[PDB]
Amino acid sequence: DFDDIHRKRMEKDLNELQALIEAHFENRKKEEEELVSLKDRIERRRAERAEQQRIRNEREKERQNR
Amino acid sequence: TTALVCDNGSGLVKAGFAGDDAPRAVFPSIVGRPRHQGVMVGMGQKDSYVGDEAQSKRGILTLKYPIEHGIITNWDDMEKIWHHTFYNELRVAPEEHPTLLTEAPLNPKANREKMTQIMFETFNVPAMYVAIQAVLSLYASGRTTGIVLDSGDGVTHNVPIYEGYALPHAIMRLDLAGRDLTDYLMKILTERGYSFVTTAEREIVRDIKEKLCYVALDFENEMATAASSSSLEKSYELPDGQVITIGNERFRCPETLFQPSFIGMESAGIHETTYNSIMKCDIDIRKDLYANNVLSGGTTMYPGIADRMQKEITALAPSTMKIKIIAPPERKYSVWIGGSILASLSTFQQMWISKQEYDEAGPSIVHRKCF
Amino acid sequence: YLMKILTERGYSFVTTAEREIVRDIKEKLCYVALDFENEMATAASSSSLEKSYELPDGQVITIGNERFRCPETLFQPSFIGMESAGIHETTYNSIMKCDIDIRKDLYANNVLSGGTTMYPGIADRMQKEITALAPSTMKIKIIAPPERKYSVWIGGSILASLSTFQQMWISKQEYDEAGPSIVHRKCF
Amino acid sequence: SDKLKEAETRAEFAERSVTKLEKSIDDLEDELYAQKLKYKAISEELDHALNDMTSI
Amino acid sequence: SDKLKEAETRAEFAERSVTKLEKSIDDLEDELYAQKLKYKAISEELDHALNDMTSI
Numbered sequence: 016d017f018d019d020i021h022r023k024r025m026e027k028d029l030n031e032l033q034a035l036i037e038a039h040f041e042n043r044k045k046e047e048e049e050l051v052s053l054k055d056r057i058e059r060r061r062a063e064r065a066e067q068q069r070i071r072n073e074r075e076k077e078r079q080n081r
Numbered sequence: 082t083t084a085l086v087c088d089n090g091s092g093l094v095k096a097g098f099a100g101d102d103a104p105r106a107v108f109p110s111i112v113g114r115p116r117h118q119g120v121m122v123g124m125g126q127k128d129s130y131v132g133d134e135a136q137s138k139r140g141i142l143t144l145k146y147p148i149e150h151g152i153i154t155n156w157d158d159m160e161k162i163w164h165h166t167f168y169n170e171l172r173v174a175p176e177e178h179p180t181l182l183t184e185a186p187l188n189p190k191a192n193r194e195k196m197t198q199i200m201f202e203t204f205n206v207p208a209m210y211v212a213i214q215a216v217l218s219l220y221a222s223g224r225t226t227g228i229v230l231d232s233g234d235g236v237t238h239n240v241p242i243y244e245g246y247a248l249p250h251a252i253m254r255l256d257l258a259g260r261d262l263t264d265y266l267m268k269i270l271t272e273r274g275y276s277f278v279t280t281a282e283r284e285i286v287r288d289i290k291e292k293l294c295y296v297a298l299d300f301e302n303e304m305a306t307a308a309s310s311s312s313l314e315k316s317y318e319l320p321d322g323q324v325i326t327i328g329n330e331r332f333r334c335p336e337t338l339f340q341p342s343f344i345g346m347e348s349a350g351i352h353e354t355t356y357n358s359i360m361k362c363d364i365d366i367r368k369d370l371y372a373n374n375v376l377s378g379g380t381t382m383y384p385g386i387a388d389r390m391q392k393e394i395t396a397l398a399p400s401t402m403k404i405k406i407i408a409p410p411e412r413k414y415s416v417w418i419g420g421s422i423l424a425s426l427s428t429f430q431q432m433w434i435s436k437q438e439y440d441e442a443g444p445s446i447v448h449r450k451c452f
Numbered sequence: 453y454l455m456k457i458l459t460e461r462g463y464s465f466v467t468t469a470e471r472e473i474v475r476d477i478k479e480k481l482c483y484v485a486l487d488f489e490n491e492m493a494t495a496a497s498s499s500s501l502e503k504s505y506e507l508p509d510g511q512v513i514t515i516g517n518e519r520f521r522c523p524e525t526l527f528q529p530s531f532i533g534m535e536s537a538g539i540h541e542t543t544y545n546s547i548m549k550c551d552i553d554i555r556k557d558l559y560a561n562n563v564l565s566g567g568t569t570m571y572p573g574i575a576d577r578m579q580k581e582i583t584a585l586a587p588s589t590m591k592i593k594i595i596a597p598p599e600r601k602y603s604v605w606i607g608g609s610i611l612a613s614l615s616t617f618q619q620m621w622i623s624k625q626e627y628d629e630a631g632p633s634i635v636h637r638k639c640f
Numbered sequence: 641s642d643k644l645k646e647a648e649t650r651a652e653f654a655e656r657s658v659t660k661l662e663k664s665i666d667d668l669e670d671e672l673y674a675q676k677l678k679y680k681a682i683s684e685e686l687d688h689a690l691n692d693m694t695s696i
Numbered sequence: 697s698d699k700l701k702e703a704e705t706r707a708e709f710a711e712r713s714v715t716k717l718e719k720s721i722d723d724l725e726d727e728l729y730a731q732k733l734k735y736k737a738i739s740e741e742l743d744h745a746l747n748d749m750t751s752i
């Protein structure tokens with residue numbers, strides 16, 4: 016007894032810390048930069064949609080104005 | 082086959098198969114009947130939501146715990162809780178599995194006898210054994226001596242053990258626990274304007290207590306600091322908005338543990354009942370008990386309690402002895418981990434109360450040699 | 453109230469038959485303003501709001517700022533002398549009387565029904581008002597199905613078509629045994 | 641005449657409403673992106689912290 | 697009749713546009729609110745970490 020405390024504690028004392036650091040690094044890398052880039056891309060597409068909407072609205076208002 | 086290590090507790094039922102690291106299913110032990118009328122037809126409305134289901138529909142229920150202080154006050158609800166635990170959270174029929182319940186020290190006999198009678202007649206288990214909640218917490222620490230303070234949610238008890246020989250004359254059981262701290266916090270929150278009354282809002286106050294409260298290292302200095310600066314005021318968002326700000330209620334709620342005069346209890350705090358429990362022991366094992374003080378149970382998870390308790394005991398104890406407080410990070414499930422270890426032992430395999438033995442001596446078998 | 457404020461331009465409707473004409477005017481022209489003061493200021497300067505309508509005999513009429521003042525009474529019942537608060541604040545009061553744990557769900561599932569909730573632009577005014585009253589974190593959503601007028605009857609058809617409901621009817625023999633006061637009993 | 645007056649009127653209301661809806665949509669989306677970018681900046685703060693923690 | 701047909705079709709198209717825009721708004725709102733709650737939670741746990749550091 017009291018000799019399995021080493022073999023159940025020291026293991027996770029380093030392996031768990033290193034593995035969680037690895038998980039955090041990979042999750043941040045996968046998540047943050049890709050999300051910001053994708054949001055910028057969607058913003059550009061949204062601006063293009065806004066331009067198309069403005070053009071169509073203006074041309075239809077020009078024709079229909081009677 | 083494998084054994085079922087159930088642990089009734091009072092506030093959270095923890096269960097799982099023997100031989101693992103953590104309980105498989107942990108869920109509050111509340112059974113709440115609906116209280117309003119109900120107009121939708123065919124909605125499939127049941128008559129009682131138990132376990133974790135009633136913590137999501139708690140807006141229209143009247144939750145009521147079936148275990149008050151260790152003892153069980155409402156046997157039908159407890160039977161319902163056990164049935165749910167076996168069939169829906171573990172999905173193993175009890176006809177093929179031994180069970181290992183846990184019970185607080187110094188509890189009424191009738192409670193234990195009724196528990197074994199239920200387990201043998203209704204659920205019809207092959208064999209069940211009842212163990213004291215502190216010996217298991219001592220198993221989990223991997224020790225064999227030490228005095229364990231198991232401050233659960235129902236009752237706080239302090240069982241000293243040396244070399245495997247428990248000292249029955251030195252058990253100090255005190256009925257202040259997490260539930261009384263919840264009620265006292267709910268009572269002192271009214272000093273700022275927030276009124277929680279419904280039995281559903283007791284859960285919200287419990288969440289506030291868990292997430293914000295902490296034990297002060299020195300009480301008077303904290304009371305003076307919180308009354309001048311504002312560095313302590315932490316805010317918290319209710320289940321509907323309207324954030325609240327807790328001031329010096331943060332460390333006043335768990336201070337009740339060390340000064341039970343706050344809620345009107347006469348007895349001394351958990352810092353002095355441990356010293357009294359030690360002093361009742363023999364003069365030659367006091368050093369070992371001083372050096373191996375063990376904490377367990379949920380309520381001992383307050384941030385900063387393992388230092389306050391050590392400071393208090395060092396103040397009380399003689400100056401030469403070394404005071405050490407074992408506070409493992411897996412405190413909450415310490416009793417259940419110990420239960421799993423005990424159920425996994427080969428030497429223990431012949432201590433179960435076999436069903437034929439119960440058939441021959443009745444429910445009073447539990448007080449006999451098979452303890 | 454619309455029939456009473458139309459008199460400010462010269463049109464007098466008195467007969468109980470002409471109440472139907474005023475009702476038709478209300479249905480076809482009135483709308484709920486998103487912001488009341490801005491609309492009152494705009495209608496008093498420009499003339500982009502004045503919509504005309506042809507009576508059952510000719511003599512077209514022009515409704516000015518009476519358009520959004522008639523249905524504004526819903527949110528300010530002080531116009532017709534009623535004391536109580538508008539439909540924007542009795543909903544919030546009805547929510548706040550409920551328990552503290554089901555307020556989020558009620559906030560998110562506010563349902564509109566009935567005929568009078570068909571005014572163009574009410575599902576936005578009500579949402580703005582409740583969002584002003586409610587805590588900033590909760591999400592306020594207002595369900596306004598296009599079949600609002602017959603919503604009660606569609607629900608009635610669904611309820612009558614259920615199999616589970618088939619034994620809740622007040623059978624005639626039951627009425628013969630307990631009299632008309634049977635309705636307050638278990639068969640509600 | 642009644643029918644087409646009704647239709648054009650309700651259509652005009654629809655157009656104004658939908659344009660207001662589009663302004664709402666864009667504001668909500670852009671605010672969402674700003675908040676998400678703040679969150680990712682916080683995530684990279686945490687990731688720098690994790691790189692420090694690589695000390696373990 | 698011709699004006700009626702064209703007006704009705706324009707109306708129906710705009711109406712369906714309205715409904716779809718509302719649905720999109722609802723979904724983006726749910727996601728943005730979930731992100732908001734995530735942010736509040738991360739900040740709160742960060743502060744708890746800070747107070748844990750204060751303790752030790």
Ligand SMILES: Nc1ncnc2c1ncn2[C@@H]1O[C@H](COP(=O)(O)OP(=O)(O)O)[C@@H](O)[C@H]1O
Nearest residue numbers: 090091092093233234259291378379380382383
């Ligand atoms: N992280 C925490 N911080 C403070 N108090 C806690 C925490 N977790 C649980 N508690 C308190 O402990 C109680 C749960 O104790 P528990 O050990 O489950 O009791 P039992 O012995 O009946 O299982 C809860 O009611 C709660 O008040």
Ligand SMILES: [Mg+2]
Nearest residue numbers: 090233378416
């Ligand atoms: Mg316990």
